[PDB]
Design a protein around this ligand. Structure first.
Ligand SMILES: [Mg+2]
Ligand SMILES: [Mg+2]
Ligand SMILES: [Mg+2]
Ligand SMILES: [Mg+2]
Ligand SMILES: [Mg+2]
Ligand SMILES: [Mg+2]
Lengths: 335, 338, 338, 335
């Protein structure tokens, strides 16, 4: 059994914890501690009640130095310097690094000095991380020697399962992505100073372009695609669930039904439960709280010559949270 | 206006009301007088909706109802309510052009009822049936209009954004094939909370979801640019904004190009032949900054991507206001055709 | 269910569909079987809208269309489509109670057409005409029901929130007079972007504004609590949320009271006679936390204010789900009446 | 002519500046400097483009140490310690204190040490401020000796003009207010740690109660009402424009038309242009960018016995911004 801690009990951290309990602790993981600078009773309240993900169906209480979730005593800690955290004295196998402040292999390595064996960054990592993993696509690159890895981004976890079967079975010459994306807490309600002049604008009233690294990052996960994809994001006024819209030039002629069949076979085969195959006339909220990384919408496929468009819905919080647990197991399992 | 084009609006829904607002808000720049509105609603309600709008704010002007007339900045506009266009007193009113905005008369056969009532021409504020005399994106193909054309289509808001964007690129680079997504504001064909609709996706709350919907607007470019017939297709994703939309076109160029070259082609078009129809934008703007912008296509050079021969270009458009202003442009072009 | 109450739903709009969902989502807690739905829409569309909802999420269960039946968790529900209730085969189906959810048959005279078709009783999912046999807020006055009552009203969602809130306070403090504002989620009588409506305020975009609207729900308390007849009035402010509303009642008490005393009165009622109808809340919650809550009135003790003899009490309510569950409660009470 | 500076060029500061220029500089004021920690080009961009208030109709450029607005050179400064600001060397008459960090008479007095003559706090002040002003209701309490005052809050500026004529002409025994209020930037897009557990919840999806001091603060402005009013706020998903809903026990019997007539007479008399009188069937967005403090909606009045309900719409940004300019003049004019 793998002993995990969560560094940063924000939205990502809370959703990882909820994902662990809501699936019946399918993974051989015990969350033995949370480190967060906020006070425990507020963080427990925000675990019990969420707007996007509703009420936690389990039980959460705070008892002394512990937050108790479905009977499990999770040690609460509040040290801003990771190397002083008692990870070694606590037997910590994997730190889920969810603060957003320690996204390089160097900064995230402080957890190793404090006694933890490994760290998974809940976001794209520096150039210098040991690996960048989309679980279901490249977790086989993991090795026992790795100690700081990145779990990529929500968007890369949607795109890579979509493009891998298509590149294998059809061939991707080049591609361009737009992700139509729910707003996030790096955005604002009404216009206010921001480093980025577009994210400074009300997220509730506008479509807001923003830069994405996900199309390029698929090159890390699928090296044969390095340099072949580019794109951007459009943030729109929804609280959760996003859409990858990928246009690509196929290397040979194809049809709508062949493209769809390739993805259906992948969803029943090696990408089962990571990639799903959807034919019903659904809308974005129907994928809220769906734990898949990539919900391919076969109803939206278009083919015009060699030009193909494919679209996939993803819960940009819940899919990623569940993948953090899958990657935790695969990392402790690497030889 | 004197010895002017006399127009009437059939259907005073949002499209018709926004044509009237566009005409008055630029000071009747076009040599047009709106002399009647036919609509089945209470005239006092239609007058109130002209004074106050959520998306387009308060009308800068005066609107009163005085008997059988709605008076706008002093202009007396006859208010009618008849379901059958052939019974409308268009000959009596000396109508040059009916702006047909109901959605119920989109073929030449149906719209011809206005001509029976004595109007000289009809412009459908939407894609037309296969029998219409022309389909016009003003700035792109108004030169095809002739004096013989009597029932025409002004295409759609989305086609009016796409065609100015793709015409310069096709002329300089060639288009092999292209696929469009329009990320589009919701419209009144959608719903607040889930309820019966003919379309199972538009049956779903528009305020809470991204909602795919079909649109023929990319295929329709072939009616205005015949060299592109059959080469473009696409669909729409409706999102929770009240107005302003984004055309996102991915296409395969016939030769190699670059971000800078694509942007330069569109900059030249915006400064030249497509001035005021197509604009060129480099500032870090968001969709609401194009609300109440009368251009057809506000190209956003900051978003251009090129990977191999695949190009993505994106253009913002006020899906109500641009089209409203183009209806007036096309009215003048039609009446000027020789 | 065996030797059960056989119900049908006339009108499968949101109100009717949410009754069906409420029945199945609590596992058919009530000894009721829904044996038919009459609606003019395509049954496959109505089935899809039962499986997926924005406000209430996915139905936890199965829904298929198999011939003339919609099959819900294995239960065969006959699907009908007839505009005239007197032609519906209610006698053939052994219907005990029609849940009348169309909005078109709210008087006893009109709803009596269901009785001509052979149903035994009708419950209108809305305020009734002056001729209905009873108006029921379950938990407050279901004891007035008699076996002779055949067409009744279940009042409105807002009356079902207000009456449980005010009944305990009137009993212990006395109400001289009261005025209510309900801060209310938008509904499908409103619009996404401004368009013609009979009401000039509901003609305006519901997503961008606070919109006042009339409601008789405070006056209607007098039908269920006659001692309060004529003492309460109010109106609604529609705001941009899809579901869950807030009753905000200001009233003048007949004796002096305090925040703590007011809260204690409502706590005792919630723990006693009004259990599960009225809840008592002290946690720092917001409206979405009451979405899909089946109570009629979720009193929020954190909001209580008293200044002199003026009291303000506020209660959250899922304006769809509470009422849906109460329709089922009132069905059982009506069929149990002696 | 009064030489003004803006400390804190956030939303309040930007809207004060826009209000000055959009009304044709009706007030005998020159904004001679802005002090803000953000960089000038971002703040100029956010002056040119706003979501709630649209595009500034004037011209804004940055030229060296100055932001030029409609031809006026406004000195730009970036000192976080007010006493080091060159206010004296710059002839600063009134500092409009808009940071939200200096809301006591003591903390705000740092501007006086730096050489400014007076400070107006753009929010409720400490117990210790020299005065709390709702312009149009009590600006006559101002005196030459005052050096730190508060301009109250947006909500108090809506409520006080509403209640003053009613108390004078009818009599307010007691009252309770609900303000149905647009969200603000102290709220969040999706649930995240906050000091207040209700404001920690998504402002776009819920009605969110919050505490207000405005009903009590009307006691400062109208001492005869001290202790007689209480209330709270409900934040709802709109970006701007709010509603005061006041229920009160009148001291004598009255009617809907008398209540409305009292307010109509006040809107044409002493409260002209501060209080407006509205009978059209309007909704909240129709009052966006309206510079009044209190837009009374006569269509909503209710009277049941001695119990009266009156409602007033207010642009909670624009009305207050315009009042800051009115109060600036009245403060420099006090003898
Ligand atoms: Mg002429
Ligand atoms: Mg005729
Ligand atoms: Mg000729
Ligand atoms: Mg039975
Ligand atoms: Mg029969
Ligand atoms: Mg009996």
């Amino acid at each position: 059994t793998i002993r995990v801690v969560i560094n940063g009990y924000g939205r990502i951290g809370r959703n990882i914890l909820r994902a662990h309990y809501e699936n019946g602790k399918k993974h051989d993981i015990e969350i033995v501690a949370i480190n967060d600078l906020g006070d425990p009773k507020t963080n427990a309240h925000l675990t019990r009640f969420d707007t996007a993900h509703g009420k936690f169906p389990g039980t959460v209480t705070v008892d002394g130095d512990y937050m108790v979730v479905n009977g499990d005593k999770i040690r609460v800690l509040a040290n801003r310097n990771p190397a002083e955290l008692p990870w070694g004295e606590l037997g910590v196998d994997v730190v889920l690094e969810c603060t957003g402040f320690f996204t390089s292999k160097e900064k995230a390595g402080a957890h190793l000095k404090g006694g933890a064996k490994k760290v998974i960054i809940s976001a794209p990592g520096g150039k210098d991380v040991d690996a960048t993993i989309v679980f279901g696509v490249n977790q086989n690159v993991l090795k026992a020697e790795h100690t700081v890895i990145s779990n990529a981004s929500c968007t890369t976890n949607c795109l890579a399962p979509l493009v891998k079967p298509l590149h294998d079975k059809l061939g991707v010459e080049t591609g361009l992505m737009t992700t139509v994306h729910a707003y996030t807490n790096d955005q604002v309600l009404t216009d206010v100073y921001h480093e980025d002049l577009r994210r400074a604008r009300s997220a509730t009233m506008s479509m807001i372009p923003t830069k994405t690294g996900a199309a390029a990052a698929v090159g890390l996960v699928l090296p044969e695609l390095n340099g072949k994809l580019d794109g951007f994001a459009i943030r729109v006024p929804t609280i959760n669930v996003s859409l990858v819209d990928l246009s690509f030039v196929a290397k040979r002629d194809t049809t709508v039904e062949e493209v769809n069949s390739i993805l259906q076979a992948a969803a029943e085969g090696e990408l089962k439960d990571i990639l799903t195959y959807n034919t019903e006339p659904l809308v974005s909220i129907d994928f809220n709280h769906n734990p898949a990384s990539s919900n391919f919408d076969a109803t939206l496929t278009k083919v015009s010559g060699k030009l193909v468009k494919v679209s996939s819905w993803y819960d940009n919080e819940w899919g990623f949270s569940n993948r953090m647990l899958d990657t935790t197991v695969a990392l402790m399992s690497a030889k």
